[PDB]
Amino acid sequence: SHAVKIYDTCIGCTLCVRACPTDVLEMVPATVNAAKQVASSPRVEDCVGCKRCETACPTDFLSIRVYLQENEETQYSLGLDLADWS
Amino acid sequence: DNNPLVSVTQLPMGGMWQTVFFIMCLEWVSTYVCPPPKSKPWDILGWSD
């Protein structure tokens, strides 16, 4: 699976969460920024690696980073449809 | 010869028996391996499923 990390530069605009195609991310309460919320990545097992969160991130450099891990590819991260590894 | 009845005789026995055997195999498959339903005996291709 890929690694989706969030950094404190986050401003809690929720655009990453809204752009998530498989609902990997969710906003959580925080005090670091004025919006009082920061995106989290609890369901990183479903991350496919499309980097749409990264596309939608406003900050100067991304407060959300998706690191691709081709060696640890799973069926959920590969979006397998015709074949099942479960 | 263009006349089909003459062409039958002009054809080799090899081809004639091959044709007869192929039609026999088709009939066997259609009547024993994949028999049509008793309600629609003419439904060879099984459309009524």
Partner: protein, 79 residues
């Protein structure tokens, strides 16, 4: 507020990232395969789900998979 408890590291959250524990069925579905079922009156069905005693393919690769998670890494709560 997540009911899931991480098996490897209790301090961390569960890898699943879910908040509601799974619901077990009344009777788990048994292994099956889609085959024909001759109707005994000349009929025949195409995709009939019929029981299969064991794994359809007994390869170690196939049988090692339990479906608990991506790597079967979810705790007992996954089942």
């Amino acid at each position: 507020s997540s009911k899931w408890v991480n098996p490897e590291d209790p301090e961390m959250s569960h890898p699943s990232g879910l908040y509601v524990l799974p619901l077990k069925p009344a009777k788990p579905q048994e292994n099956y395969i889609y085959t024909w079922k001759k109707g005994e009156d000349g009929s025949i069905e195409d995709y009939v789900k019929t029981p299969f005693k064991g794994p359809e393919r007994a390869a170690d690769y196939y049988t090692q998979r339990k479906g608990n998670g991506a790597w079967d890494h979810w705790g007992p709560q996954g089942e």
